[PDB]
Symmetry: D2
Subunit: 296 residues, 4 copies
Amino acid sequence: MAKIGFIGTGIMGKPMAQNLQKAGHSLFLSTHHDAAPADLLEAGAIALANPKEVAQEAEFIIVMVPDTPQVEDVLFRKDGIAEGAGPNKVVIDMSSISPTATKGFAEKIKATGAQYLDAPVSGGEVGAKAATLSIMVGGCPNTFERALPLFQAMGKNITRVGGNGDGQTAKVANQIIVALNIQAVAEALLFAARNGADPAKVREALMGGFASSRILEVHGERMVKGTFDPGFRISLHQKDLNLALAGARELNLNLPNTANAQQVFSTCAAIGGSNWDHSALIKGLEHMANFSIRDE
Amino acid sequence: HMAKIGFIGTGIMGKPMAQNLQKAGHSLFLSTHHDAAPADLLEAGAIALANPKEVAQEAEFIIVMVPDTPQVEDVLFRKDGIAEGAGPNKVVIDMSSISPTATKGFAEKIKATGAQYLDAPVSGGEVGAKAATLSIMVGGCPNTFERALPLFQAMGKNITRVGGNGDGQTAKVANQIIVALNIQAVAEALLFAARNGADPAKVREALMGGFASSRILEVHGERMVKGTFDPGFRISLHQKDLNLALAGARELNLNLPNTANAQQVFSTCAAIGGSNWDHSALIKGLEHMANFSIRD
Amino acid sequence: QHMAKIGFIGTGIMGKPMAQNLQKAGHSLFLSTHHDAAPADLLEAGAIALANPKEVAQEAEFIIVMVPDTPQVEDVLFRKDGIAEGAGPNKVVIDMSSISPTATKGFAEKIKATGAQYLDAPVSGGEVGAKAATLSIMVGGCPNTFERALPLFQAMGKNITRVGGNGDGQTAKVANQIIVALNIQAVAEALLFAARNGADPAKVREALMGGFASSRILEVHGERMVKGTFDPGFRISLHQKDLNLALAGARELNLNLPNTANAQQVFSTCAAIGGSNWDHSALIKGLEHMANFSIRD
Amino acid sequence: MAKIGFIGTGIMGKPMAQNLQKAGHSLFLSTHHDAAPADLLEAGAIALANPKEVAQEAEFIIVMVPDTPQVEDVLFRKDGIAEGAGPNKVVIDMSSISPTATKGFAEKIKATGAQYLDAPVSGGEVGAKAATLSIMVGGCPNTFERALPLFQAMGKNITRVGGNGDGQTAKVANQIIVALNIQAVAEALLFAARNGADPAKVREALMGGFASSRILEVHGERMVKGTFDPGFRISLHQKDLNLALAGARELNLNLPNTANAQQVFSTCAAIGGSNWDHSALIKGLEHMANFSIRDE
């Protein structure tokens, strides 16, 4: 049982802190920008002026913020995790940000004597509260062992991908497969329905062969049923595809399907679908075909 | 003497599919109009005739297995073809993977003779045809499907009726859109992972638990990591299958940007000497486009 | 100059004005009545009708074929009593249809076996250019055969160039069509970007015209895109057919042409929203549908 | 005639400032990062410690820096242009940066009482030295007319496209047409060469019709001749194409050819072409086709 700080107690963070206290850890919070939550402060938490103090007191310091700029700010701001990080302390970045930026952040955090782990989460609020998130970690094996039990308190599909920057690279690779697999099922079902066939029967038939995937089971069904209520919003997927495309431009990769998927997501947003589930990519292609795979 | 079945197309898959029907106790009838009857089929009891018509005149079911749309139109409606021998209670089953639109026209001409039609394209190659583990997607009349169901059970495993005539071919094309795009998705993500310094085997291992999980990630992903691209499903074949998809898209006004680009990447693979490579080798096209291999 | 005996197989939308300009220049026309009646105007102006393309070839020094598709070219060339049957030494067979460059090379070899010469002279400019003799003609063939037929090309067009080699005229036509479709798309994506950002597309076009972004497409199609003037000059269906030929060649010859591949998918959007018979400038309408935002009011 | 500050006296800024000095203007420089060029001081330019001081002195302050955050810095940094600017002063951003960032910078500078003009330039070191740059200006018509004699000293094709942000918007739109017209010629000449035609004769034939453009005339000849020495570097077009793609993601635009052009530029950089002239995009397509349009 260790002292744990958590910068970013929001939709996926507050829940994550909860399943950590639950495990028997003392959580420390920061009030430099936002106010300390109710179900955390009461269930055992200590409010602090800045993330530095939080880092100064806690052993493991976890960060969960929206994008790359927010990770850099909470880390190296005056009175930030860095100023309070020192030997035998471990910064765990659980946000999904630039892998290249991550490697530079890990290097600056090590200059204080502290260690760094990039542990982006693949799961969503269905894993955040239910403590069943997927976690991909980048860092040294010694440090990963220390934070290994902490991850178990918030998720189950935990993996060490490699050195610092490899956890963020793994999350981005997953996001490329997820977005492209959604587009693969979307294009195939639009073709099927344009040719007069029933997308649901094609899905059934295809789910038995090499077309089988978790995306065909879950998102394929949603595309046929028209259940596009948000679980993973298009905007969040636009942000993740932008990380992959910035990385590809920085490292000279020609990834044409990832590039196209981003433009299809833009059509979805142009028709009011920024807050639809990523499965709603079909409605962009449908708009692009002036034809729906659904009687609507 | 279970059923009298004819079979025009006894090649790399036709012959094993015909041998498997003979194992099930069926009476085979072959045409010698163009090619000589195989020795293993003749020794096992097949009866050779001159034209597909005599085959259709003798047999209750007539299976066709030829490489593309023009050869299906030929065996059906040439002089002394299947149509000129077809009639009431005879079932013409096209097992070729051809144009779903041309299929609809073929079916109506076969129904005009009093005969029934089933478009039942297969997925599984020579390995699945020999082992009778083929995926059969069927378009046609429900009674006609139930009549032919014990015959499909002797040549395949995952057998499903998708809908009316043409819907079987339509499901086959849709299957090939997903497989190709799923391969490109695994390839693009694994190229991005290796280019960012991560081990592509550990990224694949990590992604296989969550939403990015697929049969393509499991099988074709290993091929991309270990470098085993010896032909199983030639890129040349997938190019033909993707052309069927893109022709249908041009005819029915579909904007399918990822299918369109997959064909281009395949052309890069052929340009570098890979027409006969397994489709998993699509990665090598992207690797050539990035001047970077995820191996060696 | 030399007034030649010229046969013309294909008196349709493009052939008839083309055949009318050859007669204006002083040439003697020979038509075939094997499939169609000889146009009353072509006959009134001095044309002679013969029963089939063989008789036309036997009588004329040059034989032109202006037909829509590749099968029709093959038909009039090698059918019974076709052009090849009437062809021989000192006779020139000129295909001015736009068809496959790979099929063209084959037709020229079978035509030259007779001892006749073959030229592939696909044209660009449409009915109005054929009627105005302003068509651009890209020719593949022997330099001596090209100079022998140059006065005729000059009676039907203006920008006449020998690309050099049978098939190279059709190949140039396809390359011309790749550039026209992609230059339309480039102007369209740029003007959409400009208008979406609040800028006036007309002022952006004006600024861009005096620079490296300058093109005949930015000047003509760019104006159409800003004004909403998309009545067909050149239908999108026609350009889809042309891009299909380029994409067939890319697949056969192992070329990765992503922008040509994409422009065909965007043409499919325009058709899906009822635009098969719009001018190709209306590609912007497809991108506008994709952005759910029009660059016009 | 006027007092002019110039932040950014480099490959293009120095010849631009030299040309303004040539017109009888008083130049003011900043030494806060780099030493004020000797050639400028030797002609009457006054070196000051920071851009705040420069703005206090001059009536016009021109900024010529590489990207958006550099403009952001020289403007709103401590001792930057803003906290030295005020009524009757004109701030002119001659850099090629984000139109979105530009609109936000314009409103902050106008709050100082000063006026703002976004005046991006087209041309290289050659056009900057020869005063033949194309200038696209976004701002108030009076403010534009005031800077107009200054613009005429540095360039030839000057046009006011609209209010603030529109000059940068017109520059980004110009870079979309340039990169896409380069890809149009490269794709067409590759197709022609692969079919056996001489790219040179094709260009000659296409220059008299509707396919004719300044890119076919200049870059077309470079692609045919193999003259790919730096005029405009691909790295720089890559930066400009990213401004278009960021704006498309921000305003929900599906621009598939602009998106693909960036991918082709990354292939060019993977084969060592970041510093080639953007005409060398053909080398990427040639790699992707394993075939050159020139005699190797």
